[PDB]
Amino acid sequence: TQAEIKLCSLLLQEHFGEIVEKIGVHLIRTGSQPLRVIAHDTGTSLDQVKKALCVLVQHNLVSYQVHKRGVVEYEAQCSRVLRMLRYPRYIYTTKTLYSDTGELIVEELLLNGKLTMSAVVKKVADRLTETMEDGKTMDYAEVSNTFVRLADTHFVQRCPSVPTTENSDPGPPPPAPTLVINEKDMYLVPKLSLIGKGKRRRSSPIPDDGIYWQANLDRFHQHFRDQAIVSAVANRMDQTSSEIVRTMLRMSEITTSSSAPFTQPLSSNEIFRSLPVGYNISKQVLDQYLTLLADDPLEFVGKSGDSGGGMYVINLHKALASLATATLESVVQERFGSRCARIFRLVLQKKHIEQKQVEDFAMIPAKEAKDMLYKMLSENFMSLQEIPKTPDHAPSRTFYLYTVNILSAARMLLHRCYKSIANLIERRQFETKENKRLLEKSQRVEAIIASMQATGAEEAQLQEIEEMITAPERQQLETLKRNVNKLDASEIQVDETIFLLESYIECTMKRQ
Amino acid sequence: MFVLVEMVDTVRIPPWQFERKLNDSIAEELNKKLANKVVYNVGLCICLFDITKLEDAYVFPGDGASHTKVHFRCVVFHPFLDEILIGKIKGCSPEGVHVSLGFFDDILIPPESLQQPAKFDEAEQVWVWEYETEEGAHDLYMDTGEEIRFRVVDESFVDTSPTGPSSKEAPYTLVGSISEPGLGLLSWW
Amino acid sequence: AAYTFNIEAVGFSKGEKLPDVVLKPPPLFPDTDYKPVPLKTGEGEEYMLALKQELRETMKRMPYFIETPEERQDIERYSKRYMKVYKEEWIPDWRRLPREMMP
Amino acid sequence: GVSECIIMGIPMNIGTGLFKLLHKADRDPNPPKRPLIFDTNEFHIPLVT
Amino acid sequence: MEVKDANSALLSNYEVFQLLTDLKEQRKESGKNKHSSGQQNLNTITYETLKYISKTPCRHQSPEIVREFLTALKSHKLTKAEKLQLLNHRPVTAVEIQLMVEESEERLTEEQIEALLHTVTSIL
Amino acid sequence: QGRFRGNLSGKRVDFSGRTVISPDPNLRIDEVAVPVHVAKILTFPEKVNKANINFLRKLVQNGPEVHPGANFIQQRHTQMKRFLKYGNREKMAQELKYG
Amino acid sequence: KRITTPYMTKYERARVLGTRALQIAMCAPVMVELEGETDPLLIAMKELKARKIPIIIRRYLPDGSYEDWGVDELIITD
Amino acid sequence: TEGRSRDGGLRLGEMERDCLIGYGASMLLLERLMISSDAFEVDVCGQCG
RNA sequence: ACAGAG
DNA sequence: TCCAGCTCCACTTAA
DNA sequence: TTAAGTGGAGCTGGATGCTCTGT
């Protein structure tokens, strides 16, 4: 995981600083360590370790468990720091599904890690004073009305809470309080009759104290898993075929776990009432879709039942394999041409095939197909089987059967994506740092405008801003900004490939 | 205007100077090595101030000379930021005014920090200062160096090390200022 | 010239058509047959781009961005109070934090 | 070790390499330091509270 | 070689005047040798540095002149850099004390400034 | 014949000789008789100081062919050896400095 | 106090005569009155017999501590 | 070099090294095998090794 | 690679 | 030419 | 009935004195 530790070295530096990433990378790289050796193995002062640990235990990035002799060891979560890259995709998917108040609720949770409900309804209502005008303040009711609708849909979950020391072990204080999750009240919100108004930044006791709320990242990944399956059906068959897929997965939100190969089977009698009524479809045409989607050999859905009319299940693990295949075959075409992707689809279907059968079955001749075979074994998309005649395993007396393995090529393709994002961040931070003379010069001409904007700001200060020698230099600052906007956007779009890859790698692991 | 700089060093004393007290032979050897030289981060060393601790005088195998580790303090010309000095002019150039400070010579008064009523010359090297009532545009900065009084605003360390294998830039640079009222020649104020 | 190995076990049964001798090494950046697919645009893809650059400027200003402390300042002066970087300090919930982490 | 002192060309530790020699020069460790005049501690109480 | 402390103590230019003069008393009894230019770089930086000091008002001073110049200036609430520059250049008017004292018209009253002119020139 | 046994732990040296041996009881038990053909080839680099300058001037004046003699001469801070068979050795004996 | 042996060993004797001969080979001052000797090792042994060599033998114990013995206070022998 | 035809020079072998250790001779074992065979110096970067 | 010598 | 490690294979106990 | 830990048997990789003197 050298690409993961390199990429986590950048995300901790941009979002938290330099004397925290040395603590943060060292916990990922080596393992769970007590507190005295982290100051030793890195070399910072013991106070700066306590600052760097309290900022990493805040954002749910490192954990702690008590071990033998009462020592506390800190263990980082490498998968969690990589999910700091998907923050702009999280704030937008709570803008489509929820109001702009709910867009700011997730934003204060992702930027502070753990907050109380009383603190977030104040801070969101304060920040929504900028979004409004003309006497209308934001009040604590309609913020909390959006908040409790999130906890009904599990996008905000309660943190693991402190234990009750009056019930469990009264007496000597432990070095670490040994927190524990409670399944019942993760979403059982505390009641708040206290209301108020958001202050407009004029610049001139708590009932849920201890009840901290955090963003539930597993809920979004259940939601993003839906749109990968729903928009796949929308391209293949029909939009009416896609809404039926959209209907079943929305019903399967609260009733199945996030790791289940087959969801709860829903009968076709109750899908009909569950669909929105704008679709002029009968019960019989609804049974026509469910028997032609069952006719798909891709098996997005299945029958799996006979009682209650038409019983049908929609598949979860098999739907990811059809997407991760399409994820893995989309890059074979764009890197090596369309005629090379013909082979990668051929050797995938006929599971073990040789050279002579490929050139026959794919109508690509010798010396042009064999170049497209040999550039994929070196890129680890495709392997040999090497069935021998003798135990000598000599090359002149054996058969080399080509084979495409989905799992080994998907882990390989994910490992390229982590380094691909780290290279984009390194190119942006290179061009940002080398124009630190341009940006500060453009900042000083704007600071004359920014400072003294209204109080005593005469009109004879607008002509000395373009008058400085930055006037032909604006060509490069516009060449700067067209570079930063492309590299930031390409940093986001690679995360679409990661989620289709990482979900397939996660779902195929039994984790026994 | 100086600072003491506390340093450690290992000094070789060759064996023909064993007739002489070791406290005198170390002080002669450290002045032969540190005088008139700009150490990188601390500045220009003038002379040895004192020796503060003198450890054991080992004799290593393969040599008869006595090696001893020396703790000492050295006086260093290193003016702090925003300090007022007095010195003479070396001459004039379109790049600025070259101010001489006795032993030291690289002091640049930049044209962006000159006194504002004259900022550019009439294609001539010697810089002027135009006062309206008397001496318009001819109050000159003479190359013979009458005494001025300037204010240091910037100092810079360039690492004069070899870049590349083997087989003259100024390492200790200093940027003064004159634009404050009261600075300048000793005649003007 | 003859080698230690047999060429006939490598190949070259005719005895001719040996590969040519590379005179100059290949370039650092060999040119590509295919190009990057252009980016996806739209009103959803661009708002996430706008939200991303706002998070850099935000999280660099928050007190969780623990800067490194300054040192080796040369002298004291009265302008230190004018150059005092003021910023509010966040304090955690020590009930959730272990006891070994108090300042 | 002995065998890799012979390879690396440094003198070995056994034999005559076990001890170190000092030269008995006329030396005065800790000589009387020069007193400072300006920056003594009794005249420079700091400015800030 | 290695440096243990970058800025140990501030030095008045009288302390260098006493240092280079007492260095000269044991110097020039043994000339340079042309075994190396170490005796060359020593002699140029020692002679010329004392000549720059020999035009400054740091001459004719004593230790106890400096010991009382810091004594009278103890009750004026000035920094070490503001107490040092009053000894090296001997300010005689109130225009350069606005340079040697930062925000001089805001920390010190006009009488407090003018008493500082009498403090320097009557001791030095 | 590798590096470790053949060239590192044991290696060929110079200032060394090898001859047939033969007895002599008129010597002591701590003496050895070196032939003059080997005593002219083998040299010991004697530094010039205050105690041996009059001896080494005569050993330079004998030269490389008469037996109490010298084959090379090296200046004080130079690394180049003047081969003493040529030149006037009465001049190079007068210029013997210390070191 | 000092607990190690008071007799100079053969290794101390050999290296003291070696380092003293290398010092006398360079132009170091001689503590005894030489009488026509040219080999520096012979002058070193005359200085050893007369107890005048300015070398302090520092003996390192295997833990890290040491003892500073003078040459003029070890018992010399054959 | 090797032999009498090539003006060779003699060999402190493996066994004669073992005798010089037994005497405790450290500087003689340094002079024979470093100073008078193949003495040399190298430039070493102390950072990257 | 072979022969010698101690 | 002689000798320690490494790996393969039957052979009891234990459930 | 069989899972498993440990014996005995075969395979493999290592080693075997110091120099000069010549063709």
The single-letter code of the amino acid at B104 is F
Q: Could you tell me if D14 lies within 8 Å of chain G, comparing CB atoms?
A: no
The single-letter code of the amino acid at A101 is T
Q: Quote the tokens at residue A5.
A: 């530790």
The nearest CA of chain D is from the CA of H24 a distance in Å of 4
Residue of A215, A219, A210 whose CA lies nearest to A107: A215
Residue of A429, A502, A459, A492 whose CA lies nearest to A85: A492
**What whole-number distance in Å separates Cα of residue B108 and Cα of residue B177?**
9
Instruction: Find which nucleotide's C1' atom is closest to H11's CA.
Output: K19
Contact state of C101 with A53 under an 8 Å Cβ cutoff: yes
**What whole-number distance in Å separates Cα of residue A253 and Cα of residue A276?**
17
Residue of A188, A179, A126 whose CA lies nearest to A157: A188
Chain G residue with the nearest C-alpha to that of F54: G38
Q: What are phi and psi of E51, to 5 degrees?
A: -70, -35
Q: Locate tokens 């893995």: which residue?
A: A328
User: The CATH number of the domain where A338 resides is what?
Assistant: 1.10.10.10
Instruction: Find which nucleotide's C1' atom is closest to H8's CA.
Output: K20
**What whole-number distance in Å separates Cα of residue F43 and Cα of residue F55?**
16
Q: Are A82 and A501 in contact (CB under 8 A)?
A: no
Q: Are A150 and A102 in contact (CB under 8 A)?
A: yes
Contact state of G24 with F49 under an 8 Å Cβ cutoff: yes
The vertex-C52 CA angle with C49 and C57, nearest 5°, equals: 135
Out of E3, E7, E89, closest to residue B86 by CB: E89
The single-letter code of the amino acid at A393 is H
Which run of H or E residues covers position A327?
A: helix A317-336
How many beta carbons lie within 10 A of that of residue A230, not counting itself?
A: 18
Contact residues for A115 (Cβ-Cβ < 8 A; gap 6+): A108, A109, A123, A212, A213, A214
Residues 144-173 of B with CB under 8 A from E: 149, 151
Same-domain status, A381 and A335 = yes
**What whole-number distance in Å separates Cα of residue A394 and Cα of residue A414?**
34
**What whole-number distance in Å separates Cα of residue E101 and Cα of residue B129?**
26
Residue of B71, D37, B24, B83 whose CA lies nearest to E19: D37
Q: Specify burial of residue B2 (Cβ count, 10 A radius: 0-12, 13-18, 19+).
A: buried
3-state helix, strand, coil in chain E (%, to 5): 60, 5, 35
The nearest CA of chain G is from the CA of H27 a distance in Å of 9
Distance, CA of A271 to chain centre: 30
Q: What are phi and psi of D16, to 5 degrees?
A: -85, 5
CA D9 – C1' K23 distance (Å)? Answer: 38
* Three-class SS state of A128: coil
Residue of C73, G53, A257, B84 whose CA lies nearest to E87: B84
How many beta carbons lie within 10 A of that of residue A231, not counting itself?
A: 13
What are the binding residues of H for Zn(2+)? 45, 48
* Three-class SS state of B84: strand
Greatest pairwise CA separation for chain B in angstroms:
79
Q: Quote the tokens at residue A311.
A: 């019983």
Interface residues from chain H to B (CB-CB < 8 Å):
26-27, 30
Q: Could you tell me if C30 lies within 8 Å of chain A, comparing CB atoms?
A: no
Contact state of H17 with F17 under an 8 Å Cβ cutoff: no
Same-domain status, A350 and A379 = yes
Same-domain status, A314 and A335 = no
Q: Where do runs of H (alpha helix) occur along C7-100?
A: 7-10, 45-59
| Nearest protein residue by Cα to C1' of nucleotide I5 | F20
Chain B residue with the nearest C-alpha to that of C74: B80
Return the axis-axis angle of helices A239-251 and A283-292, rounded to nearest 10°. Answer: 90
Q: Could you tell me if D45 lies within 8 Å of chain C, comparing CB atoms?
A: no
The single-letter code of the amino acid at A204 is S
Contact state of E10 with D37 under an 8 Å Cβ cutoff: no
Contact state of D39 with E79 under an 8 Å Cβ cutoff: no
**What whole-number distance in Å separates Cα of residue A364 and Cα of residue F23?**
94
Q: Could you tell me if B81 lies within 8 Å of chain C, comparing CB atoms?
A: yes
Contact state of E79 with C78 under an 8 Å Cβ cutoff: yes
Contact state of B4 with E51 under an 8 Å Cβ cutoff: no
Q: What are phi and psi of B3, to 5 degrees?
A: -130, 145
Q: Is the dihedral of CA F19, F23, F27, F29 positive or negative?
A: positive
Residue of A331, A494, A334, A327 whose CA lies nearest to A422: A494
How many beta carbons lie within 10 A of that of residue F73, not counting itself?
A: 18
Eight-class DSSP state of B145: -
What does A88-117 look like in DSSP terms, one character per residue?
Answer: HHHHHHHHHSS-HHHHHHHHHHHTTS-EEH
Same-domain status, A336 and A307 = no
Resolution of the determined structure in angstroms stands at 3.1
Return the exposure string of C10-44: e unless at least 16 CB atoms fall within 10 Å of the residue's CB, then b.
eeeeeeeeeeeeeeeeeeeeeeeeeeeeeeeeeee
Q: Could you tell me if G60 lies within 8 Å of chain H, comparing CB atoms?
A: no
Contact residues for A356 (Cβ-Cβ < 8 A; gap 6+): none
Q: Are A427 and A443 in contact (CB under 8 A)?
A: no
Question: Which whole-number Å values give the CA distances from A504 to A252, A326, A358, in the listed order?
Answer: 19, 12, 28
Question: Which whole-number Å values give the CA distances from D14 to H15, H21, H24, in the listed order?
Answer: 18, 8, 6
Q: Quote the tokens at residue A323.
A: 């997407």
CA A389 – C1' K12 distance (Å)? Answer: 25
Q: Could you tell me if E17 lies within 8 Å of chain D, comparing CB atoms?
A: no
Which of chain K's bases lie under 7 Å from a protein CB? 18-22
The residue range of the domain holding A277 is 220-318
Q: Specify burial of residue A188 (Cβ count, 10 A radius: 0-12, 13-18, 19+).
A: exposed
Distance, CA of A157 to chain centre: 17
Same-domain status, A369 and A403 = yes
**What whole-number distance in Å separates Cα of residue E52 and Cα of residue D35?**
23
Residue of E80, E87, E64, E76 whose CA lies nearest to E109: E76
3-state helix, strand, coil in chain B (%, to 5): 10, 45, 45
Residue of A121, A194, A175 whose CA lies nearest to A151: A121
Identify from F14, F20, F43 which residue to disrupt to test chain H contact, counting H C-beta atoms within 10 A and taking the largest count: F14
Which run of H or E residues covers position A73?
A: strand A72-76
Out of E3, E41, E52, closest to residue B5 by CB: E3
Domain extents in chain B: 1-79, 80-189
Contact residues for A37 (Cβ-Cβ < 8 A; gap 6+): none
Contact residues for A253 (Cβ-Cβ < 8 A; gap 6+): A153, A222
The vertex-C77 CA angle with C76 and C80, nearest 5°, equals: 95
Q: Locate tokens 């109130």: which residue?
A: E94
Q: Quote the tokens at residue B189.
A: 């104020």
Residue of A211, B48, A238, B186 whose CA lies nearest to E90: B186
| Strands of A357-460, DSSP E | 383-384, 387-388, 398-399, 402-403
Chain F residue with the nearest C-alpha to that of G21: F47
Q: Could you tell me if B165 lies within 8 Å of chain H, comparing CB atoms?
A: no
Return the axis-axis angle of helices A87-96 and A100-110, rounded to nearest 10°. Answer: 160
Question: Which whole-number Å values give the CA distances from A151 to A39, A94, A185, in the listed order?
Answer: 40, 13, 11
Eight-class DSSP state of G29: P
Distance, CA of A75 to chain centre: 21
